Amino acid sequence: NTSTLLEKALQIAVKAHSGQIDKAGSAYIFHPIRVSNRCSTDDERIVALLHDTIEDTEVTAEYLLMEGFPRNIVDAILSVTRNEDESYDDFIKRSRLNPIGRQVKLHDLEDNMDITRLNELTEKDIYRLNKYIKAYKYLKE
Amino acid sequence: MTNTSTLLEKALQIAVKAHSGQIDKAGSAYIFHPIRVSNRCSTDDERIVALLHDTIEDTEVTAEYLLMEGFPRNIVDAILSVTRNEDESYDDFIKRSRLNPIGRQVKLHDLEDNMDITRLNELTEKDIYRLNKYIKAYKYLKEH
Amino acid sequence: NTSTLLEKALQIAVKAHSGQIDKAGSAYIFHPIRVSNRCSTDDERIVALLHDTIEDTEVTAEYLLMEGFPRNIVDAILSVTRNEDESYDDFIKRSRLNPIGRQVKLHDLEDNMDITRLNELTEKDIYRLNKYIKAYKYLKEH
Amino acid sequence: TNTSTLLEKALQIAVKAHSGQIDKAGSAYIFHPIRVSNRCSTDDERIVALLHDTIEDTEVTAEYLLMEGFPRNIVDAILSVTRNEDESYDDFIKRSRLNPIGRQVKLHDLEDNMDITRLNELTEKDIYRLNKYIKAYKYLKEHH
Ligand SMILES: [Cl-]
Ligand SMILES: [Cl-]
Ligand SMILES: [Cl-]
Ligand SMILES: [Cl-]
Ligand SMILES: [Mg+2]
Ligand SMILES: [Mg+2]
Ligand SMILES: [Mg+2]
Ligand SMILES: [Mg+2]
């Protein structure tokens, strides 16, 4: 009962992130939604809705391919999916090389840097916010 | 996860299922309409009503079903304030929406999304009449 | 009247903050502009454009009254203008009492919590940002 | 001068050049480049948005902007969204798409011009120009 591939990516994310919470206390599914609302194209919105499904849920790149998602979309999701064998800097460098992933990752950083949603702030947060700021600047050069 | 945060996730899953496969005038999935309206809201109470504001027309989603799912009476009343009654005229419908503090705000963001012509392929004369009606209602909901 | 007073408020702010900068080096004039962009009414936008003119520049309250800004607008600006002998805690409590000042202050805290423009984030910012979060929550309480 | 950054100078130039001008909604025109600039993502886009309509002002010219310190690629971007005297609108939109910064600014320009939430009413005379905005908006979206 799906009309468009953007609707499918939503239903996949809502199901996959069901039961997860972000560090602010809210349902995690609203993070890819808030990133998707910052996007400008349907391709960016699809990747934004799924950008944390491979890392955090049972969704795999293989599953997305078998569900009909195009090669450039899945590769764009993989460009914003960190591998353990790489540093965070090498991950952001790999994100910038992808036209769709670069834009989605920028909006992902913006959402993660939105401290207006948080209850407090600790020293562990500012070290994480700092590398977000460095990655945010790198992706805008 | 708090009760309001749980209801907000619950409200999303109820909207996704109810609007599954539905399309709007442009042809895109209708679910993104409540989501775009929600993104304009400021509080979680408003976000919940925004996500469910067009689900009463669905057969599975009723007022008692939402009460059964844990949504409090004030939230459900807000959803009913932005749900047009059977024989109710548009002018009478906007008047009823302003009486509800949450529904009034949600209806404003609903009008903003409906006035967004960046998603339309072409504008006709019928669209002008419809957009003029949204402008009048938008202005009415912003007064004191 | 309101469309012209909004423009006048912009021109008063531009002239008053001219050449001032924030901690990131960006032009400070855009802080009231970005706060005014988050507002929903013309009264809020006017107060937001002028909310740091008394404290940071040579604009006075009598000056704004002389230019035609109504009493409620000037009072709202004063509700978000910290006094000398007033602590930050009492300042936030006083800004919540004014309907327009409360809303503009909320958007002011949102702009001050925007770290997308800072070059880096240190530990001294923890105190400032947590203070802003606490003040943000107090203003949102109903 | 008494200006900090090129962005601030661009603001002051737009403020002066549009001073007293009014838009279709009856508001001060200066807030149009500001609202276009609020949609932009980089400082280069914001500078061009703030100045995207200053060339009509007799004081503001390409030479003036170069004199003030604005880089040539910024000035060329402003000229990419400045329509020529005998140029057709379609040819103007095609020319603005070739410029990376200008394309983005022209999209945000079109979004603001299509924002009918600021309008007090709509007539059928607005149909043609709104359909031109929609057509040009889609044409700039075909890039990706
Ligand atoms: Cl990571
Ligand atoms: Cl939402
Ligand atoms: Cl830039
Ligand atoms: Cl033109
Ligand atoms: Mg993410
Ligand atoms: Mg609706
Ligand atoms: Mg301030
Ligand atoms: Mg323009």
Distance between CA B36 and CA B119 in Å, rounded?
12
Question: Which tokens sit at D46?
Answer: 């914001």
DSSP H helices, chain A, are: 5-16, 30-37, 42-50, 53-56, 61-66, 71-79, 88-96, 99-112, 123-138
Query: Which method resolved this structure?
Result: X-ray
C34 → chain D, closest CA residue:
D38
Q: Does D127 touch chain B (CB under 8 A)?
A: yes
Contact A7 B1 (CB under 8 A): no
Instruction: Give the CATH number, domain containing residue A102.
Output: 1.10.3210.10
Sign of CA dihedral C29, C32, C38, C43: negative
8 A C-beta contact, residue B80 and residue B137: no
Other beta carbons less than 10 A from residue B5's beta carbon: 16
D107 → chain A, closest CA residue:
A40
Q: What is the helix (H) or strand (E) element at residue D31, kind and residue range?
A: helix D31-38
3-state DSSP call for residue B23? Answer: strand
Q: Does C61 touch chain A (CB under 8 A)?
A: no
Question: Which tokens sit at D117?
Answer: 């939430």
8 A C-beta contact, residue A72 and residue A129: no
D-chain CB neighbours of C41 within 8 Å are none
> Is D107 part of a structural domain of the chain?
yes
> Is D1 part of a structural domain of the chain?
no
Angle D137-D140-D141 (CA atoms, 0-180°, nearest 5)? Answer: 85
Q: What are phi and psi of D39, to 5 degrees?
A: -80, -15
Distance between CA C137 and CA C125 in Å, rounded?
18
Q: How many domains does chain D have?
A: 1
- The per-residue DSSP string of C39-63 comes to --SHHHHHHHHHTTHHHHSS--HHH
Contact A27 B20 (CB under 8 A): no
**Nearest C-alpha neighbor of D122 from the set B138, B143, B108, C6:** B138
C-chain CB neighbours of D28 within 8 Å are 3-4, 6-7, 10
- D140 Cα: distance to centroid of ligand 3 (angstroms): 20
Question: Which tokens sit at B34?
Answer: 């409540």
Question: Which residue segment(s) compose the domain that C75 sits in?
Answer: 1-142
Question: Which tokens sit at D123?
Answer: 């007539």
A-chain CB neighbours of D141 within 8 Å are 41
